[PDB]
Structure formats: C-alpha cells, structure tokens
C-alpha cells in the first residue's frame, strides 16, 4: 500500500513513530536495541519538541500522543520486548542490570492499527 491514510490525521503519531524509529535506529547502531527506561524516551522527546511548540496545546498533544503510543505499544502492538519483571515494571528501586534485564525494548518494525 502507498499509504492507508488514517482518517483522523496522524501526523502527530507519525512524529512519535519517527521518534521510535530514530531512537532505536541510532541506539541499535551505537549500542544495542533502545532498551532501558521507556519514560526517558518521552523525557528527551519533549526536550526536543519543546522547540517546535508554538502553543501549550502542541505540548499537551505531543505528550498525550507519545503516551498513547507507548500505552498502545505495550498492550496492543506487543512490539515490546521485556525479560524479568524488575526493570520492566519499575515499581521498586534498585532494578539491577546484572540480571540481564533490558527493561523495555521496542521492535524496529513498528506498525499502525490500520
């Protein structure tokens, strides 16, 4: 398909998906496969897009979009790879790296729901 064209407008989701593919493509080439704290991805993302924010609505939108994508990723997509339980949830301090846990990993092949 040339495009599906998600009737709603998904340029927002595309910018977030671009973030996913960009972070991962760099990290897989530099180190391994994104892994680590999923929240950090939003963190630095906001730090980048903050420069394009014309208005608070843009910021709010970007935040809720990236969040929805991560929420979707973890539940529906299942393009998330995780190992133990410890660094995955991040509900307790002291998630050890020696335990070979990669925390949250995202598949290089992401997709849309339509």
Q: What CATH number corresponds to the domain at position 29?
A: 1.20.58.870
What is the length of the chain?
Answer: 114
CB-based contact 19:70 (threshold 8 Å): no
Q: Report CA-CA distances (Å) from 45 to 41, 50, 83.
A: 6, 8, 25
Query: Burial of 58 by CB count in 10 Å (0-12 exposed, 13-18 middle, 19+ buried)?
Result: middle
Q: Give me the domain span that covers residue 19.
A: 1-114
**What angle in degrees, to the nearest 10, is found between the helix axes of 56-72 and 11-30?**
60
Tell me if residue 22 falls in helix, strand or coil: helix
Type and span of the H or E element at 44: helix 38-49
Q: Please give the tally of structural domains in the chain.
A: 1
Using the 8-state DSSP alphabet, how is residue 103 labeled? Answer: B
Provide CB contacts within 8 A for 96, sequence distance 6+: 86, 87
CA distance 3 to 12: 16
Q: How was this structure determined?
A: NMR
């Amino acid at each position: 398909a040339p495009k599906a064209s998600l009737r709603l407008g998904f340029s927002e989701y595309s910018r977030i998906s671009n973030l996913i593919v960009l972070h991962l493509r760099k990290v897989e080439e530099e180190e391994d496969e994104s892994a680590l704290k999923r929240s950090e991805l939003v963190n630095w993302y906001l730090k980048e897009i903050e420069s394009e924010i014309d208005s608070e609505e843009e910021l709010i939108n970007k935040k809720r979009i990236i969040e929805k994508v991560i929420h979707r990723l973890t539940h529906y997509d299942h393009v998330l790879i995780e190992l133990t339980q410890a660094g995955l949830k991040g509900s307790t301090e002291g998630s050890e790296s020696y335990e070979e846990d990669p925390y949250l990993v995202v598949n290089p092949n992401y997709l849309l729901e339509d």
